[PDB]
Structure formats: structure tokens, C-alpha cells
């Protein structure tokens, strides 16, 4: 005490191969000051400020607020948890490397938790500053606003993009849209232009495409009677699993989007609010917002965040209650010192 050693495991990609009773000192591959001490077979991480050999020096700390804030999804981290006296620590070494998903995991598991609530728990970033966080809940909640690239219960709100799990169909015969709406399901998927072998080459799984056979490539008319006289409705879980493979999907054409027009900055980059703000956007108006809504492309390259949220405020669509909300998502970030 203060510590737990041989406790749980560690994850890691990265492991070297008469006599190892004897402590083990390793250098990691890759970059540095980063030096490892094997006691056993477990990874320590120790910085002291008086050189020493095997030692690191003093991290920086992040400027990355460990209550609102996010780290880049795209990146790896490193979690630790310890001790820190007077100018030496001492950490043991959780996650070694590991992305942000299998961090969630190996960080719930069965034999981890002691260790975890007794000990200091903080992140090392790739670029060796280091997040201190006062609890281990406060380190879930971060790793779960960071793993995504919107965030999917807002998304899915009746507010923005809604859910419905039953078999519907937007517009109507005194549409302009018409003959372009198919039958749709959970959050806005539309089936119109899908056939089946295109939803399980997107990694949906065998049983919910097999039960929707008899609804793809259906438009218009067709769409239209089919949803009044045979509708099917999905279980909440499959209706959540499918909309989530296709909000991903598109996030992904509207990151591509913003990184190819070179702004001095990554979509990774954004804090979560904006990123789902921008993508609600396009997912309504169609995803290429150069064209399809100018002025709020316009002011997100030259990064005027003010600009940003009147672009939103000014648009007529005859959806303005929703552009409205998605400016107060940016609106948001903006008051909590996320942006700029």
C-alpha cells in the first residue's frame, strides 16, 4: 500500500520474449521518454525528476478538460494507475497502446476493479501529456464521449433525426420527394435504393436482413401501400443496431468531407456536440453541404464559430425549430470553452 501489482492483467500488443527472477528494463520501440520496468512479467511506469537511468522525466500536463472534454477517437491511449509523491510516481500500467474500445472493456473487467478505486487513475496521450483524472468514473464517462463520433442517444431524440422502429414513410403524394422515399426504419434508413446483399456487405447480420426481404428498392407508390397495408415492426435492439451501422456510415462521408478541404485541423479534432451538429445537418439536406447548405459550410472553414451558429439560426427550410437546435448544440461548446 498504496498499490495492488499482480492484480487483474494488462493488454498489450507489444511483448518481448537465463534468469528472470530478476527485473527486466525495457525502452518502448516506438518513441520516448518512455521506459518500462518489468517487475514479473507487469509493465511499471515510474517518472522522477533527478535523472536516473531507467527513469522518465516529468510529464506536462493536458490543457483537456477531464470533465466535458474528449480525447480524438482516431488515437491510442495509454491508462494508468497509482501513486505520487513529492516529486516521484509511481504507476502500474493497464492499457499499453490500446485503442478506445477495447480500453471500455478491459477496464470493467472482472479482475480489475480493486486496484482501480484505491489508486489514482490517469491517460497517457500519443503525445506524452497526461490527463489526471479524480476518480475512475470520471475516466469511463470520458472514454465513452470519446469512442464515438456523434453521439447517438441525441442523434436518435425526437429532437433531431427521431426513432421508429415500425415500418414508415416520410412525404407524402404532394411531395417533390415522393417518388424518392422508400420504406424506412429506425432512424431514417431508407431502403428505396438498398438491396439486401448491400446491407450485409455494410455488416448487418444475417437475421435482420433476412427479415426485411419483401421491402427493398421499393419507392414511391409501391413504398407507399406497402407500409398501409403489410407493415412490420423490428424489436427496439435489431431497430437500434441497424440505425447505428448507418449513422456510422455517414459520419464517416462527412469527416472525409471536412478533412479533405484542408482547415487547418481534423474532424477528430471537434468536441462531440459540433461533430453530431454538422453530421444532423447533412444527414437531413444530403451530405455534401458545400452545396446543400453554403453559408454553414461556408462559415466551418473559416472556423467563425459565431458565424456558425447564426448560419444555423438564418436558414430557411421549413425545418427551423430542428437547424435552430443543432446552432444551441454549437451554441453549447462554444459556453463551455470547447471551441476556440
Known amino acids: 500500500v498504496p498499490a495492488f501489482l499482480f492484480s487483474g492483467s494488462t493488454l498489450s500488443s507489444y511483448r518481448p520474449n537465463i534468469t528472470i527472477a530478476l527485473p527486466h528494463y525495457v525502452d518502448l520501440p516506438g518513441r520516448s521518454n518512455f521506459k518500462l520496468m518489468y517487475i514479473m ?69 472482472k479482475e480489475n476493479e480493486d486496484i482501480l478505486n484505491n489508486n489514482r487513475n490517469r491517460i497517457v496521450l500519443a503525445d506524452n501529456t497526461v490527463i489526471n483524472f479524480d476518480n475512475i468514473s470520471q475516466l469511463k464517462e470520458f472514454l465513452r464521449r470519446s469512442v464515438n463520433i456523434v453521439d447517438h442517444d441525441i442523434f436518435s431524440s425526437n429532437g433531431f433525426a427521431g426513432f421508429n422502429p415500425t415500418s414508415h414513410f416520410p412525404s407524402n403524394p404532394s411531395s417533390d420527394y415522393f417518388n424518392s422515399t422508400g420504406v424506412t426504419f429506425g432512424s431514417g434508413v431508407d431502403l428505396g435504393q438498398r438491396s439486401k446483399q448491400d446491407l450485409l456487405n455494410d455488416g448487418v447480420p444475417q437475421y435482420i436482413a433476412d427479415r426485411l426481404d419483401g421491402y427493398y428498392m421499393l419507392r414511391g407508390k409501391e413504398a407507399y401501400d406497402k407500409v398501409r397495408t403489410a407493415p412490420l415492426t423490428l ?58 447548405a453554403p453559408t454553414v459550410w461556408n462559415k466551418v472553414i473559416a472556423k467563425d464559430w459565431n458565424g456558425l451558429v447564426n448560419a444555423f439560426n438564418n436558414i430557411v427550410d421549413g425545418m427551423s425549430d430542428r437547424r435552430k437546435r443543432e446552432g444551441a448544440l454549437v451554441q453549447k461548446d462554444i459556453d463551455s470553452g470547447l471551441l476556440k
Open 41 to 109: 512479467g507487469f509493465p511499471i511506469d515510474t517518472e522522477m525528476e533527478k535523472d536516473s537511468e531507467y527513469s522518465n522525466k516529468i510529464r506536462q500536463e493536458s490543457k483537456i478538460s477531464k470533465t466535458e472534454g474528449t480525447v480524438s477517437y482516431e488515437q491510442k491511449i495509454t491508462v494508468e494507475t497509482g501513486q505520487e509523491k513529492d516529486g516521484v510516481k509511481v504507476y502500474r500500467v493497464m492499457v499499453l497502446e490500446g485503442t478506445i474500445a477495447e480500453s471500455i472493456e478491459h477496464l470493467d473487467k
Open 235 to 292: 424489436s427496439d435492439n435489431e431497430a437500434h443496431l441497424l440505425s447505428n451501422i448507418y449513422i456510422d456510415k455517414f459520419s464517416h462521408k462527412i469527416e472525409g468531407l471536412f478533412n479533405d478541404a484542408n482547415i487547418g485541423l481534423r474532424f477528430s479534432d471537434l468536441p462531440l456536440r459540433t461533430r453530431t451538429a454538422l453530421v444532423s445537418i447533412g444527414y437531413q439536406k444530403g451530405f455534401k453541404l458545400s452545396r446543400t
